[PDB]
Each structure stands twice: as C-alpha cells, then as structure tokens.
Write a protein that binds this ligand. Sequence first.
Ligand code: B12
Ligand code: B12
Ligand code: Z98
Ligand code: Z98
Ligand code: 5AD
Ligand code: 5AD
Lengths: 109, 109, 728, 728
Amino acid sequence: DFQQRRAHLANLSDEELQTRFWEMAEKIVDPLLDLGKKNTTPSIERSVLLRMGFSSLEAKAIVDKTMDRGLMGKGAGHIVYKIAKEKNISVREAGLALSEGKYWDDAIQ
Amino acid sequence: DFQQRRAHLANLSDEELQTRFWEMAEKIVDPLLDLGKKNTTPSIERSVLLRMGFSSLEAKAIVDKTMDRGLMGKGAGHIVYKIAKEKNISVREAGLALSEGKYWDDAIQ
Amino acid sequence: LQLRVNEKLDVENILKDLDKYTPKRRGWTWRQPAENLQMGPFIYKDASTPLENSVALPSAKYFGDIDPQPLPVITTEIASGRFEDDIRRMRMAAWHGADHIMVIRTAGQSHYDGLIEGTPQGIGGVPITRKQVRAQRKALDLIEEEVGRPINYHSYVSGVAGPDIAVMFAEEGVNGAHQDPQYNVLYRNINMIRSFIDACESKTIMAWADMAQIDGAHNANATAREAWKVMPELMVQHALNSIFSLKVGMKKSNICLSTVPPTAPPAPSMYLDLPYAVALREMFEGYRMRAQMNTKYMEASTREATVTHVLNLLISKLTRADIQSTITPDEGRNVPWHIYNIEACDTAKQALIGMDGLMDMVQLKREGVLGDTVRELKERAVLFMEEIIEAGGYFNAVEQGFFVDSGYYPERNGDGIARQINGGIGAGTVFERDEDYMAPVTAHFGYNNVKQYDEALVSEPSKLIDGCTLEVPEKIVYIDELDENDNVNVRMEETKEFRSMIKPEVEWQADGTVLLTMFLPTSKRVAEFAAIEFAKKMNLEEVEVINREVMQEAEGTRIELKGRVPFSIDINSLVIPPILSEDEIREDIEKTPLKIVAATVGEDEHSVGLREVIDIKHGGIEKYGVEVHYLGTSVPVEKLVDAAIELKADAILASTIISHDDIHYKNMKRIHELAVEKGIRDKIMIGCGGTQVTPEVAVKQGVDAGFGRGSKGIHVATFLVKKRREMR
Amino acid sequence: LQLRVNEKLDVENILKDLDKYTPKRRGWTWRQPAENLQMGPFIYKDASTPLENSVALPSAKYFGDIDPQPLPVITTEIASGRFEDDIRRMRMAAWHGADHIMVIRTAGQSHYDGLIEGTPQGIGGVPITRKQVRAQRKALDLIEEEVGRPINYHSYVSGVAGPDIAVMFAEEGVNGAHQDPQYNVLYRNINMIRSFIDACESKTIMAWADMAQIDGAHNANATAREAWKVMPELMVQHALNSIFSLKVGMKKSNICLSTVPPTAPPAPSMYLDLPYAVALREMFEGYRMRAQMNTKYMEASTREATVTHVLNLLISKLTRADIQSTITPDEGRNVPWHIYNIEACDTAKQALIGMDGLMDMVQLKREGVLGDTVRELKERAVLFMEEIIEAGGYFNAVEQGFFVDSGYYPERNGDGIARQINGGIGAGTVFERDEDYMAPVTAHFGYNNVKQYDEALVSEPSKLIDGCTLEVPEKIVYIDELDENDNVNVRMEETKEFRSMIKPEVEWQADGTVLLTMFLPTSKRVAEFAAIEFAKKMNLEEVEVINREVMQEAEGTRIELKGRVPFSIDINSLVIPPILSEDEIREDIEKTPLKIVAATVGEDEHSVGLREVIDIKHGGIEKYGVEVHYLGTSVPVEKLVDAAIELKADAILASTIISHDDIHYKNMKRIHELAVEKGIRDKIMIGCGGTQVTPEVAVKQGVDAGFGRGSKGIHVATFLVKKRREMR
Ligand code: B12
Ligand code: B12
Ligand SMILES: Cc1ncc(COP(=O)(O)O)c(/C=N/CC[C@H](N)C(=O)O)c1O
Ligand SMILES: Cc1ncc(COP(=O)(O)O)c(/C=N\CC[C@H](N)C(=O)O)c1O
Ligand SMILES: C[C@H]1O[C@@H](n2cnc3c(N)ncnc32)[C@@H](O)[C@@H]1O
Ligand SMILES: C[C@H]1O[C@@H](n2cnc3c(N)ncnc32)[C@H](O)[C@@H]1O
C-alpha cells in the first residue's frame, strides 16, 4: 500500500511537498477556527467574567444562570455590562446581583 | 615556539609526515632491539629454564649459581644442556644437580 | 528581599501575604548565549551565561569547580502533591542548572469545569490554584535572584476549563504552559467541538501573556503499541496544533513541538529516531523544539534510564533543541525523589557540555539512507493529511478512529480511539453567538460586537470597563482557602515539630524513606523475599522491592528496596570533630627540595610495600617531586643511617614486612637509637612502614611517623611536609 | 562435565585436579559480524553474532527480550584479591555480554623477580600464578560454552619477570596480555636496559601464543597534570611499543593501542578528544584500537561516571574500537562490586547498540577545524620524535626527563620523571651473550648458536631437547601451594557454611556489605554524620560514607554509605507465596466485546476518579477496547440501572466519592437491590469505587468488586474479564 498511495507525491520537490503539507494542515484547521469565531462555551464566558472582576465561584453562578435563561448567545459579560448601565450601578454590583438571582427578568427584557 | 619548531614540517603532505613519524620511530627502537639480540638477563634465562622443564624454584637456583660463576654469557639452558650430555644423563638430572652446587667445576672446565 | 545561601527557604514566611504578591515579570525567557566563553582553562562554543551561584558537577573539582551551562533551556518536573515541600526541591534543581520548572497537575485536573481554589493535597500532581501558583512564583523569584538567572515557571492549560486557567496563568505571570485541543479530545474525551472552540480563547490569552506553548504530541508515543510506528501521526498532531496556534496569533517563536525520540535500546534507536528528528526540524522550521526524554521504554534501572537519556540528548545536539526537558532516572521505579531531579539536571548539563562544539566536528550524511527516510516520513504525513480531508475533515477523522491507531500510517489496524462529534465531556455546551454578542476584555478571540456601544473602542474592548484584569490587576478576586481542614496551613502546622531532630525524606518533610541496595547470591524470587527480611532486620518499615536485576540465574540477583526509618536523630546529640592538597604538597617541594633515603631493612626481602609508596604508578612520593635514594633489601639499619648522613638526607623510610618475635618494632628502635648515637636525630625525619605496623606504636619506638596496611604516597608525602614544617 | 543454567558454578570441583587441566583453546578471538542481522522487529547494521544464553537489558522486555551484541570485544575488570570469589562474578559478566576478562595483578607483582606459586591473597589485585591461571581459564572454558561464545582471558606481563610470565601465559592458554617495556621504566622505575632486553623475549613468547597485546600508554593519562596536554607524548609511547612489537615479529592485527579519551565534562571533552582519536587512528592505520574509559576525571557519583562513559563510547563509535574496555562506575567510590561490573557491561552494550548504524547517518567534518587539529597533533608528535633522536635516542630522552612532563609538547615544564640508564630495579643484571651462547627452546629472540651443535636444527632449537614445554606440555612443573596458611582452601573452609544460609556480598562470599542512599535536609558535614548514626541504628557495622552530593548548601545533601549486615538468613525460614498482561486483557476484549455503563452516582459531583479509571491517559479501561457509555455525575442509582438494561451493558461501574453517613456503602447496596429487583443481577457485573471504599466492605454490600485509593484501569479491566469468565 504505501508505494501505490505515494505515487502522486513522488515528483514533488521538497518545497512543493512541505508547502503542500502545510496547505492541507491549514484547510483541516480553518473550519475549527471558524467555530471558535461564531460560537462560545461556558468556560469562555466564565473566563470573560474572571477578567471583568469576578471570582470563580461568582463566574460559575452567573454563567449557570445565563444558561438557564438561554442567554449565552449574548455573552455573560455583556449581560453583566448592559444590566450595570440600565440600573446606573457598577459592573461589580450588577454581576454580584446576577450571581444571586437578581435582574434576570430585566435581562430577558 | 611551536610555530618555529614546526616550520620544516609545514610543507610536508600527510603521507610524508606519517612516513617520517614511523621511520623515526624505527630509528629509535633499532638500538633497543639490538640490545635484545646481543644480551640476556636473569629473567630471560629463568624463562629458558621453565621451558626446558624446570619449576620456578629450580630455575631461580640454577640462574643464581650461573650469575655467581660468571657464565650467564653462555646461557643457563646451555650450561644445563652441556652438562647433561657430557655426563650422559637427563636434562633434569643435569639441572637438579646444577641447582645444588654439582658439576659447576665441570662447567668452568 | 533576602535569601542567604547558608539558610533554608522560610516556607512559612513565603505563605504569608500571598494576597499581596504580584509577579515580578512576565513572559517566557530564553538563556543568554555567551560566544567563546572562557571558563578556567577552556573555551566553549555552545555555552550560555554562567550562573551567579550553583553546584558544579562532582568532577568539576579537577577543573577549578567550573559550572558551564549549555544553551538550551533545561526542564525538571516537580509535583508531589505538596507544593510546599516541592518548593524546596525547586531550589536544589535551580542550583543544579534547571531553569524551567514544570508542575504536573493533580490527576484529572483536566476535568474540573472551572478553577479550584486554595491548597488541597494533590494526587500524582499539584492541584493548580491561584494561591499555589503565587506561593511558587514568589518562591521562584527568590530562587532566581539567588542563582542569578530567571526561571520559567510552567504548568498545564489542558481541559474543559482551559480559558479559566489561561486567564489565571496570564495574571500570575506563569511563563509557559501546555495547550493542545487534540490532547483533550484524544486522551481526556473532552467533546471535540467544545475543545477546539475553547482553545481559540486559551491560546489568545497565552499569546497576550507572551508564554511559551508546548503541544501534546508526546501522548501519541505513550499510547502507541510500538512507538516506532507512530511518527506520521505525531507530525500531524504537531502540524495541526502548530498552525491552529499561529492563525490564532501566537508567535512562531513561542510555539514548541513536544518531541520525544520514539525508541530506546535494545532497539537501534539513533538510527530509527534520527531521521524522524531531522524530518521534524525541516518540516517545522520556524517553530521551536521541546525535546523531552523517553519514558515508554524504561524500567526500574536508573543506570539504564540515564544511558538512554544521553542518547536522547545526542539526538538533540545532532539536530536542534530549543528546550531540553528532562525525566528523572527513577521515573519508572518510584514517584520521583529530590535526588533524581538533581541527577536529571546534572546529566543534561554534563552530557550537553561534553558535546560542546560537536557540530563543528560532526555532520549529518544528509543524502544517504537518512535523506530517503526523511523524505519517506514527510510523505507519510502528507498522506495522513490528504486522507483527513478526504474523510471530510478533522472531526470526521477522529470519529472514524484515525488517531491512536496502532498501524504505521497508511496501514490502519483499526484500533484507534473514535470520539463522537456529539459525545464526550461537555458535549452539548457550544452556544451560537448572537449578532449582538459582546465581551468587554482584552484578548478575546471570537466575534465581539463592540461597535454597538463605541465605534472607537473596537480595538480595546476593555475600555468599556476601564480595564479588565489583564490591565488592572486589582480587580482580581483572590480566594485563600475554601476547605478549613485540607490545606497548606493545617499541613505545615502538622510538622512545626521539625523546625532539631532530623530524618530522611524523598519528597515530603520527614517522610523517612531511604534506598537499600544489595546483591544476594540466589534465584531472583528468593532474592526478593530474602532482601525484605534483611531490611526488616535493619528496622526498616513499609519495605518494598522496587528494582530486581538478574546477574545470573543461579549466581544471584541485584535488589533495590525502599523502606521507612521509624525514628529520628537529634542533630545536637552528634559528636562532630573539626587537609593538605596534592598541589599544595607539590608547590612545597619546589620551593625547598626534599631528599630521602629508603631501604627494606634487616634480612627482609619483601620489596613491594616500600616501592608502592615510592613509585609514581600508584601515587607513591615520586609523584610529588620527592628525591629518593633506594638501597634495595636486606639492608642493615646501620648502612641505612650511614647512607642518610652520607647522602645528606631529610628522611629515612624503611619497611618491615617480616614480623616474627616483633623483629619489626625491634628494628625501629635501632634506626632511632643509631641516628641518636650518631647525632643526626633532630635534624632528620624517620618514618617506618610495614604490614603489621601500627602508626601509634611506632611513634612509641622513638621514630616520628608509623605506617600500616593501606598507606598511600599521599599519606607519606603529607607527613613529610608537615613535620619539616614544625621545624623550619 | 556439564554446567546447568540454574546451578551455581561449583568452585571446589573446579579447584580439583588442576595438575591435569589443559587449555581447550589458544590465542585471541575477535567477535564475528552478523551482517544485517534481524532480531525481533529490527535489523541491525553493526551487530555481531548473538549469544545462546544471556541476560538482555531491562527494557528488552518491551521488544521480545532480544539481546543484540555489538562489534567490539567488550572488557570488564575482575580482580578482588580472591580469584575464587572472582570466578562467580565472571559468569555474571559473561551473561551480560563481556567476552574479554581482564585480571589486574596484586599490587606490585611487577617487582617479583620470577613466578610466584599457589594461591595467596592479593591486595588490590589477584596474585597471578599457574594455579590461579589454570583455575580461571578452566572455569572460563565452562562459562564460554554456556553463553556460546569464546571468552578471552587477560592479565599483565609487566615487571622484572616478563619472560617468566609470558612463558606461563603461553603454556596455560592466556589469550591476551599487557606488555609495554616503557611502562616498566617510567612508572615502576625498573632499569631501562633490563626492561627492553626482556621485552624482546616476552613479546616473542606472546607472538608464538597468538595473543593480543595491549600497551601501557593509558598510564600517561593518569600521571598527566592536565591530560589534555599529554597527547603528543601518548602518540609517541604508542609508536615505540608498536613498531618495537612489530619488528619483534608480532602481527599488526594483534598490536592494540590502549587509548583512553583524555578529558571529561565539564571540559568540552568531545571537542578536545575527538581530534586526538582521529589523529591516532589515521597515524596507526593497521593497528588495533583498544578503547578504554576514563578514570582520571572521575568521582563517587555512579551517575556521573556512567554518562562520561557514554561520551567515551561515542568517541569510539565516531572513530574505531576493536576492543572496548569498560570501567565500573563505582571505581572512584569502592573497589569494584559485582553489580557495578554488570552495569558497565550493560552500559557498553546499551550505548553501542543504541548507536548501531550511526555512521551511515553522521560523518566527520574532516576538513575544517578537526583536520587542522589532527594535523597539528601529528606535527607535535613528529617533533617529539625528532628531539628524541636529537638527544641521542630513547635512553637519553628518558634520562633528560622527556616523559611524564606536564607541558604541552614541545612546551616542557621541567617536571618529568628521569630514570637513570645506570639505575633502577635490576640495574646491572644485563650480561653479554658469548659466541657459544645457546638456548634449546622455541620462541627465543636473541642470538642463539645452535649451529655449534647441529645446523639442521637452527630453525627448531628445541629438537636439541625433543621439544620444550611449548611442544611438550607434559614437561611443565605444576606447583600446588608453597604456603599452607595463606591459600585458597583455608579461605574456602572459612565460608563452607554459606555454601543453605545467605547474606549480601559486594565482592567476597558473605562479606555482608550493602549500600544505603538517603537525602537529609541539612549541610553536608552534619548530613554525613547524621547519615552515619541512622546506619548505626539500622544494625550496620563498619559504616563508611562513600559519596556526598550537595543538593543545595542549606536545603540538604545526598549521602551514600556502605556497611555490613551482621546477620544471615535461612532460605527456608522464608515465607514465599506462589497475572494477566495488557495484551491478554486487550485480546480477551477484542474477541468478546465488553460494554459498560458508568456514573458518579447519587448527588455526587466529584467526577475525576471515575474518568481516571476510564480515560486512556493514565491507563484507564478505554485503552483495552472497552465500550464505555458514561452517564455523568449525580446520576440516580435507578437511572444507572435502567441505562444498563436498555443498553445491554455487561457491567456497571460506579463512583461514590462523598462518603458522609456511609452514603458510599449505602448506594452500593441500593444498586444491587435494584438489580435483583429488576431481575438482571446474575447477568450483570457491578463494580463500585471511591476514595473511602474498602473492597472487602464493598463486596459485603452485594456488589462483585470494590475499588479504593490508587486503583487503575488495569485493576478494573482485570476484574471485568476475570469475573465475566468466572460467570460463564
Ligand atoms: C609475595 C610475598 C613474598 C615474596 C616477596 C615479595 C617481593 N618481592 O616484594 C617471596 C619473595 C615470594 C616471599 C618470600 C618469603 N616470605 Co613472604 N610475603 C608475600 C606476601 C604474600 C605479599 C606481601 C606484599 O607484598 N603485599 C603488598 C603490599 C602493598 O603490602 P605491604 O607490603 O604490607 O605494603 C603496604 C603497607 O605495609 C605500607 N608499607 C609497607 N612498607 C612500608 C614502608 C614505608 C616507609 C611506608 C611509608 C609504608 C609501607 O604501604 C603499602 C601500601 O599501602 C605476604 C603475605 C601477605 N598477604 O601479606 C608475605 C609474608 C609477609 N612473607 C612471609 C614469609 C614467611 C616468607 C618466607 C619466609 C617464606 C619462605 N620462603 O619460607 C620468605 C622469606 C623472604 C625474605 N627473605 O624475606 C610471611 C611472613 C611471616 C612473618 N611474620 O614472619 C608472610 C606474612 C606470609 C604469611 N602470612 O605467612 N613472600
Ligand atoms: C477536587 C475535589 C472537589 C471538586 C471536584 C471536581 C471534580 N470534577 O471531580 C469540587 C471542587 C467540584 C468539590 C466539590 C465538593 N467537595 Co470535594 N473534593 C475534591 C478532592 C480534593 C479530590 C477528589 C479527587 O478528584 N481526587 C483524585 C481522584 C483521582 O481520586 P479518587 O476520586 O479517589 O479516584 C480514585 C479511586 O477512588 C478510584 N475510584 C474512584 N471511583 C471509582 C469508580 C470505579 C468504578 C472504579 C473502578 C474506581 C474508582 O480510582 C481513582 C484513582 O485510581 C477531595 C479530597 C481528597 N483528597 O480526596 C474532595 C472531597 C471528596 N470533597 C468533599 C466535599 C465536602 C465537597 C463539597 C461538599 C464541598 C462544598 N462545596 O461544600 C463539594 C460537593 C460537590 C458535590 N455536588 O458533590 C469532601 C468529602 C467529605 C466526605 N466525608 O464525604 C472531600 C473528601 C474533601 C474533605 N475532606 O472535606 N471538591
Ligand atoms: C601496563 C601495566 N602493567 C601493569 C600494571 C599493574 O601491575 P603492577 O602493580 O604489577 O605493576 C599496570 C597498571 N594498570 C592499570 C590497568 C587499567 N585499568 C587498564 O585498563 O589497562 C599497567 O598499566
Ligand atoms: C497536554 C497534557 N495536558 C495535561 C496533562 C495532565 O493531565 P490531567 O490534568 O489531564 O490529569 C498531560 C499529561 N502529562 C504531562 C506531560 C509530560 N510530563 C511532558 O513532559 O510533556 C498532558 O500531556
Ligand atoms: C472538597 C473541595 O471542594 C472545594 N470547595 C468549594 N467550596 C467549598 C466549601 N464551602 N467547603 C469545602 N470545600 C469547598 C474545595 O475547598 C475542596 O478542596
Ligand atoms: C610467604 C611467601 O613466600 C613464598 N614461599 C616460597 N617458598 C616457601 C615455603 N617453603 N613456605 C612458605 N612460603 C614460601 C610463597 O609463595 C609465599 O606466599
């Protein structure tokens, strides 16, 4: 088998062969990168919350509640942000509230 | 230093240098081999005796007497051999006796 | 602020005020090259800057105690479950040259769907938390200022909580980490759609933090049935992670392939592994190489491991290693111990320094079977890639079992691991982003609608909140401990006890383990159980046989065992007393020359003992420049003393081997008296030697020094120059 | 008479009837190449013929326990002082590939002016005599038939009694010998005329016996101040013995240069020694290369020793080694122990095999800096010879101290050894041969006037006596013992008991020694002393520290110690009890598939433990081919049971980490109940695991097996295939 299969590659110069290797490597990965552009996961949202000022405990609670309300598509961080602004409160307060059940009806609205 | 010493080798090829090294090695050992051709020692002579069928205790004793009577120059083996013939007895007879003081008169004669 | 080389790490003090600890610096550091570096009498071609403080190789004592450091970053792996003990080992490793400390995580940390907090006890690794990372980074700041050279602190971003860890790591100045979305799928069965989406973010963060990334391809060695068959797959895993990471935006110079030579002796391992190594350095020019050493084909022998490691290092020197990680020689025998991390570091240093400049003298035969085999491996990889696309991509490829298969690609034995696009851990947790999705932080990978709020802030989404934690470290929420009983404070409180009894350890304070090595003249199974009965009778407990090697089936067996010491030693209960060097002795004799007369006395014909301490062959005094007048044997004391006067000597040295009716002491008396009788006695030295001599009893017979069984020329040379020195 | 692989070598029987023993063989044997030899899955390029019986390397088990053997003859050095103990070690060494056994002589044998007889105890070596030679050669004759490849026996011809010894070695089968007339003068101060006149005879006797000759050049390494300055002297000593031996009549192919690479790390040792090695082999084309390992720059770390030995071995591989000698890695620590010879044999073998074929892929960059240095070294050496001639020859050179000078020739520092042409041991024992000088024997070098007795016998002088011992072995005078106290039988009666009780030994029957390695957290001095006390309290006698390594000044120190076990053990008083492989478990499941449902059960969210016995990463049952449906955590017990019926699982594996209120054992009972209740209990295997699970207690709740701390996939997969079998 290896002989039969390699036949097309048998005339490629080392750089034809190396760039081909890499070209295909690239096609194998582009779609995975696309999924990463257009989608999210609870770890990504929790991590976004870490960076916005929240603990692990707090991120879990906000994101768990974000999933319950089918709001992941907006970004848990966005929720915390938009709520902060339409209650004239701090980021740090919106998120703590949210992590405790408050303001979810307002978010859905 | 070294750079001065080596000026006369500088133009030699690798082959001529090897040759020179060995021809000089052989000049150096030639006189040593020569000494070998023309001289004997207590160790060489005990070793001839060992090879003629004598123990090491015997061979020391025969050689220690040969040095004593000044006949190393003939060969301690020689001495044993001659004595055996001239008295018409076995090489070990000759030698056993020689190692305890007998026939040394005859040898000098 | 502090670290004194003669005082231990105040680990307690280290654990204080972690809430206030900020890392000193960010990112990965490489070693600094040092062109044509002179150290002692030598010049080195492949060296980096020497350390300010360090422990040199044992045989460095012959050369001014030089500690040349090679150019590759050197890794050692420290993680026993108790990071607070481990911190002490880190200090040993840095002194022996390690500048990359890798902390393997407590088993299954990949599965924690978020950060954990505090300092629980780990299992086969350390549980990675903010407090623990701070402890160690803080520690390695102190250790690095001391040794004089920055240490890269390193752990793992693997798992379902990759993005969470990448953030924590990035805030706390973790210098390097492993991340490979394929690891998660293949070996942890993390859902593959979630794994690849998470990696985009994890890598984006690591790029921000300028960390070195290591990939997961060493795993394919471990899970291959025959590792010399798995090279096409490795190339593919290396390629896919590599280019993924590049397109995410990570620098080529931070992307490092984790590459372990597949085989070990008795395989012909250089020949099998060398073409793989070249093909890999060629296809992956641009990227970094993290060589790491064999673990697959390894057993309970530290000797055997070490030898294989030097060949591993050779493959690195003959090709290229940006990072050279190490594996401890006991790894396949026991959980690693302090002394074996150190062995590993010294071995890497020793071997690489040994090979300094080698590539100015040796080169690859690039055309020849090398070239053909390299070309073949590259083709096998290319074909692997073509078939992945033909199956419709990466996901389809994994579902059909292309990976972890035992065949030599393109042969497929059909025993791969097939993960399911819809299955695995966190299957069902991917969420589509809406048109109005937004995240207001630095270093987010994906679609981010920032324009809906501020056109201007698109390029710095954090501004919406006046810094996320990558800009404003004060917004980090530090948690101390969540478990009141299972933590570092309770554990350290547990051994305030030892802080001045002492006992052994291998990894944790006072853990009392030691290593027992013996040979036993019998069959191996009998040997094994006989060995335990000796260790018991030496009062060891928890005794385990951990290496058996056969010498010969009948003749006997090597056995190593580890055991526990069930008591301690009061340091202060120890009687501990309060040294001229060969070179010191030699310089002394050049200034003022020393002259000797020597004979084997009486009617004694035994010449050797005296000759042994004179001939240079076995370190006799000829070595140290001494001038010796030897008068043979059966030489009466009279003539020996007359000869010292005659020759105008500094010492008489006589031998007595024959000792019937104490004739050997009776003849020392004489020399001393005879030398007195003639008057030279105070102006000259007299040593005397013999099989049945006692260095005590011979000063008793008048003479100055005595010498028995085992005397060397160092001893008699020592004597001479120290006595001479009492006078002049 | 026999030899059986499971019966110990019978020394006493070996010692019987030595006056009747002849050599089976004479002369030297090289190893036979086995071109392109296949062993297990590999083909070898530089292999030699395999052994019929041997111990393979540890890691050979992963490859069908193959034991490939390399090109060069391999040496080990066995010489404890008691040859009767040393035979047993020889057997071990032979199974481990050693096919040249070298017996270092008792300290100062060179000074014995003639053969010694019997079997007195040596010190630092074996007293070489006809009896001891016949015993070891007889035993080796047996040990070589066992392993299935000839073994070369080797000792030394040095000293005042050269020709006596060469005769005895000739007569008694010795296969190889050291002989250099320079060794005698330079290092033992034996008269130079006596020395060279004896060498002529010696070497002739050695030629006759088709023996391999090893020279004495290595000694110049030991006596160098800086071995990297000593090379031009080395080339010179190698030449003179080599040409001298050539003209005496020795075959080039038997003339072996003793070449040790001069440096060791932290010197740039490859870079320093590689050009010497190349220059030496270029210049001495046609001669044999006896590579030997470094002892000069060595210490008490076995590790350090072993690594430098691999670089030594690399040097050989990059050039040539016809014989490769080995050094035991304990040689700077103790007199070599059994087990450390065996290390050396394994290291030599492992490294060389690991480099099999290496020179098809790598070559010397002979043009460039290497050739420049090769050339320079050669020129330095030619100038050395020039000056010798210019001085008026060898004897003047030596007198003027040309040799053993610390300078880098032609730099001379003035510190050389100077021997007196008139002087030394045996000055004035050279006698002029007369015109009627004669010796009626074969293998005599000098002028022999046999013409005066018979011109026909000139070429066969022993016809004069009807054969010398060289032709008529029958004439050899065998002496058993001269001393009736110090002989082999008194020593043997001392340990007759130990021949059904046992103790450890390092070199001599029941010597009781063992090694203890430990780390102690304190400075090296205290650590040393503490270490002595722990060894005391462990019931060890005669305790010496033999190795100290600083981990770090404060943090701690590695100590190693030897000591004696004062007790013995009866092999009967020992209680010894009377397993499925990975492959076996894999095979069982390939053929009969095996589907499992699993879950962490109840409310429990701790998931890691269960995945850890399942994911393929740390050996979980996935790796064996088990189809695993995972239901997650907090899965109620009934749910897991319904899942098993619906999916037709062969087993339920469940985890239970929280154990508050015996909730672990309880949900065990509720699963068995539910199974019973639903009428599938005897069709299904139930395994339950968790941190506080005690298997015995688990089985008592009705489940088939329980799994606690430290469980692995292999444990779990083993129970599954075992129970299922038992079930049907
Ligand atoms: C080989 C040997 C001989 C050789 C001589 C060796 C030679 N040419 O040098 C021959 C020649 C074979 C021989 C002959 C005899 N020997 Co003897 N010999 C031995 C033997 C086996 C070896 C000793 C030896 O050389 N050791 C090697 C060296 C390294 O050890 P060392 O000599 O003790 O030297 C070390 C230390 O003592 C110290 N040292 C020694 N001298 C000095 C001097 C100075 C200044 C210093 C600083 C240090 C120092 O440093 C050295 C190295 O660390 C011993 C037995 C034994 N196992 O010890 C007997 C032995 C000593 N000799 C013995 C006897 C009886 C004899 C004979 C009488 C036997 C007979 N034929 O009847 C004859 C007499 C010879 C004579 N005229 O003196 C007995 C002595 C008994 C007694 N106490 O009287 C011994 C002990 C054997 C025995 N145990 O029965 N033997
Ligand atoms: C990490 C951890 C957690 C994590 C778990 C993350 C995860 N994904 O698993 C989080 C952080 C989630 C956690 C939460 C809690 N935990 Co917790 N946790 C730990 C910890 C430190 C380690 C557990 C672990 O993963 N060990 C490593 C694995 C590999 O070991 P293992 O589980 O023993 O598995 C091995 C064996 O048991 C065996 N095995 C196990 N199961 C099975 C099954 C089968 C079929 C087989 C064949 C073999 C097998 O194989 C494995 C090794 O080979 C332990 C303490 C400890 N040292 O054990 C507690 C601990 C178990 N949890 C504890 C508690 C109290 C909690 C919380 C209640 C705390 C709280 N928040 O109030 C919660 C409860 C959450 C819940 N809903 O259940 C207690 C349990 C107390 C008790 N007496 O029951 C512990 C003991 C800590 C303590 N001493 O207080 N904690
Ligand atoms: C040429 C020669 N003759 C005799 C002796 C020793 O033998 P006496 O003590 O009887 O002099 C030595 C020393 N050899 C060290 C061996 C090394 N391990 C080797 O690999 O050769 C020697 O070099
Ligand atoms: C990419 C990756 N992630 C995580 C883990 C740890 O695994 P959990 O957290 O899943 O238990 C491993 C495993 N071993 C360490 C690497 C090796 N000691 C090395 O030198 O490379 C891994 O390879
Ligand atoms: C059992 C594991 O669960 C985590 N954990 C999270 N919250 C708590 C809590 N309130 N009490 C105890 N442990 C907790 C860790 O503290 C611990 O290591
Ligand atoms: C003491 C040493 O002297 C040598 N020797 C030579 N002859 C005798 C003898 N008759 N008795 C004892 N030893 C003797 C030995 O071979 C011994 O080892």
